[model samples]
Target chain A: DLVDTTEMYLRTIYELEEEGVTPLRARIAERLEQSGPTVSQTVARMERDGLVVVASDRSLQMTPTGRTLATAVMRKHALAERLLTDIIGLDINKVHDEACRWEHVMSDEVERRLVKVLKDVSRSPFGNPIPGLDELGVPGTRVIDAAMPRKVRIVQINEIFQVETDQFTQLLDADIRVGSEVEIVDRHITLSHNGKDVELLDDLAHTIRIEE
Target chain B: DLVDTTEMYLRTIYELEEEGVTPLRARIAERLEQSGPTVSQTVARMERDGLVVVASDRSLQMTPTGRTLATAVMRKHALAERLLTDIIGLDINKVHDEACRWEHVMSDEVERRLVKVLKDVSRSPFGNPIPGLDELGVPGTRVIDAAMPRKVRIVQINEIFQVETDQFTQLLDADIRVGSEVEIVDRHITLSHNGKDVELLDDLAHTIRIEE
Candidate 1:
């Protein structure tokens, strides 16, 4: 029904906008795993289609029509991720791409039906609240290089980063998942699981959110 | 991930083939309700993409690749139609178009899950069996134009014709749904409901199937 490739570019741009990241052609290409030249050509076409506007400094911004498309697709993505991961019990690492496919096809009627069945799903399986929900996201501090010797709860993780999944699941493999208690010992993020101290690098920790 | 409009055309062609109807470009156009040139352009592209092969006598044939593509999408469409019209209690007149949107988005994993919950559904809500479950739709005889004074049971009705929905619903409205007993009297398609003989034109009767 829609241009799937075009919709994905719009969705990636929307996520970048939310994270205060620059909506550059290179950035979008990286996210979409397309070549830089392909992103450049597509973005030019998008500008022609009035789904996007090129800013004075050459950063891309979504026009009103584009934002509407993005929000609807994004809302569908978040809800679908929740459906697969939360309801279907699929592994967290795999469902994002599946949800990406689902967002394109979910009709407004099915979306309504799903909302009724899902019952108060305020957040997606990745821990980011869906756009249709109450908040942007709950506030939490970064845990990568947190102030030491303090116990805190892991709150959220970045959904925009494709590489973040394996890292998060590694924590889960160690029984340290979202809402798990972690002790920050002098810039080291560590969790005690099953009588073992599990630790991950600061790069993995950098994507995590925590509440002291 | 797949070309949606293209897939729909393939599925429609597949249906036309199932009914022993020729899949000429004009026939495909009429079934899709699309303009002639538009169908022409898309069919050309489909041929180039190896999803279709045009035979010597101008009949369109599904390539090996095309059958695989069409069957997967058609299977999804039938299952989704069942989900909407059978389980969710949506109007039968409305769900075929709705299922069209759903087929493009349903993942193989989600399709598997739906198959499990639906529990060996032998046919679609409208009585056509899905492709994945075994063979294509079962053969049923049309009794709407049957002989006069013949006592028969209503079995299946034609689903391909878009204009037949309201007439089918009128049958349901008169308590003459799929399994209802009826007495055909001299070109009059009549059913007894609530101590009343409900009659519709035999033109409508011509589309319905019945069993002796």
Candidate 2:
């Protein structure tokens, strides 16, 4: 059994790295819902354990060992999501946090079983690339950056920000998902699909990626 | 998330109660692999939290709230074993500890979905009854208690000791299981099944249940 605290912090830092965001203690605290002092103490402990290093700019970075554990955790998280959605038939919008809890508790044997059952799943249902399986292969434009009034296909959803918030379910209600085709109809980033227009906040728009 | 320490202790006490073993702190420490001082301190904390009470004999007892939490945890443990074995195709011998981890991290939503998918599994593959759904129906004699050299069907395997030890896998190797029709040929509790005789230690024999 792993120290759960170590795994959680590593996974959070990994997610920040994936999103190209600086892994600050404040961001880690926000995501984990721990107090800043708690995050600082834990990060310090992690540094002592050789799992992480704090940069001169006060950003957190994973050591080689830390990234390995984080990747394992993330892989388990994605596999759990797949199992919950595909086999158990849980609501897709609900798998993220369920998988988060599952990731901490799973074993290598369970991970192997999941990999076999899921059969080469390269990404989670949310379209976040499952670590160690595939790269973020296709470069896509963020909805916030892509020119409006153009037809595009949904590619990825930011697992850290979007799926962590209720924005994920909002996208589900708007009939948006990976592989969904929609037209960005205006500068406001209103989406048009099947004759329905759905408004997006600028913040949520930044977390969705599309390919023209 | 539920405090894992609380859940583990509660579930351990429930198991002891199931086996008619007194819930002493020593037994709790043995089961949980915690130090004596640690168990004492934690049991004190559990009492302080109003989840447990200590008798004059210094045995542990769950309060109404504690029993509820313990029952919920046991339900999840059995459901997780069912999921791992029935759906994920994990080795039955491997599911007990895996389920132990899974039970702590599971949410009610995941538990609900597991229930729907697992479809009213009455017992774990190891034959421990799933709490809140079914009682210990059809009383059977322990192999240690029953007279020898009679045809019998295995009804239960002790999840706590037998499974925790590698003795569970030994039973598996001997082709023994919950529904196995075995013949006890000697007072030494040698099991005769499918024209093969397998010796079981007296301690292990006590944990195995059979019906004549």
Candidate 3:
């Protein structure tokens, strides 16, 4: 079944919840960069579909069916992201967009293959774990915020878009690789030239999988 | 500048010509998998646009500007293909579609960064060449038909939409990676599966590069 954009929004909300963030409507709007009205309308639809329930504080929560559907969606997207980065040699940033485009088009058979590939992957091309629904489901899974001060181990590297060759080579120079470890001294999101919060890291951190 | 689909067709025709394939309308139709009338109409438009010339025998050739524009398109596409594959980790099959989408959206600066990243890539995450525009521009660069007895070096691998992990792993196990070379030793265009060539290759033929 093809899940629409609204369904995807709820699913992303569920993922954010697993990451320790409350699935508030405003927060969802912020993450998706959509208008509050649009988010409201979608949330209404999600509620109608029994995929989400509006809490007393107007925050969103996933229903059991919603969780199941969201899990599947997350699994599909994560797997696609991994395949696009690891097998296809794309840049890390582009994986999200590519996965967004592809999540609606892929079949179950393809999803199964992607899951297997992730299991066998020693490390993601970008040195992060190819995140799976299983990992996302673990009760004690680590949820390190971009701002958290912690030592990180690169379990996979997501190369899912076109990145500059020199930049890519620099990754090797920095000894930032799958299984390599590092500490995130700082991270901040601030308004930049585009009027968006540009995430800055002391180290070049596009996307890194970390062990706390 | 964003070139339209019509121009892309012309550029593809030029590309085939560079590969030593005679550019005929019927042949263009065949290559593009389009109807003859559609090809004829588009060629007419291109002729009016001063992008193409049809000879007495109806052979198609690019005018000088047409050639320049076509080459530009090819260069952009080739580079985008490489960037999407080398950095993004998109499967080779999927890069065509993603590149087609991104070729129109990105700016020259983005393109420059993409080129830079591609050049620096030693191996794609899947271990393929971040195939540059140089190879496409090489005077005698030829795509050995699937049935042809020639070694095929994987320049890139695009699996952006791949969903099954097992199948993805299986592809890796088969050593079908970017830069991994393979040779085709058998030829057959079969109609058994409804009008397409089903090339067969020995397992050993999948190992290394060879020439016809």
> By TM-score, highest first, what's the ranking?
2, 1, 3
DockQ ranking from best candidate downward:
2, 1, 3
Q: Which structure among the candidates has the greatest TM-score?
A: 2
Give each model's whole-structure lDDT.
0.72, 0.80, 0.55
Which clashing pairs does model 1 show? B144-B205
Model 3 regions lying over 4 Å from their true place: A118-212, B1-212
For candidate 1 chain B, the 10 contiguous residues with the lowest summed lDDT are: B132-141
Q: Estimate, for each residue in B11-32, the C-alpha lDDT of model 2 and write its tens digit.
A: 9999999999999999999998
> Could you tell me how far off, in angstroms, the CA of residue B18 lies in candidate 2 after the best superposition?
1.1
Q: Supply the global lDDT for candidate 2.
A: 0.80
Model 3, span B1-212: residue lDDT tens: 12466656866786678668889988899877888998898888888989899988789878987877766565556555666555444546566755554444443334444555555543333343333344332222222333324454544334453343343444455556555455434443111111222232233123222221
Write down the DockQ of candidate 3. 0.02
Model 2, range A58-165, lDDT digits (tens) per residue? 998889999888888888788888888888888666778788888887776676677777755778888888885432222367888864276789887665674346
Candidate scoring better on TM-score of 1 and 3 = 1
Per-model i-RMS: 3.4, 2.8, 8.1
Question: Which of the two, 2 or 3, has more DockQ?
Answer: 2
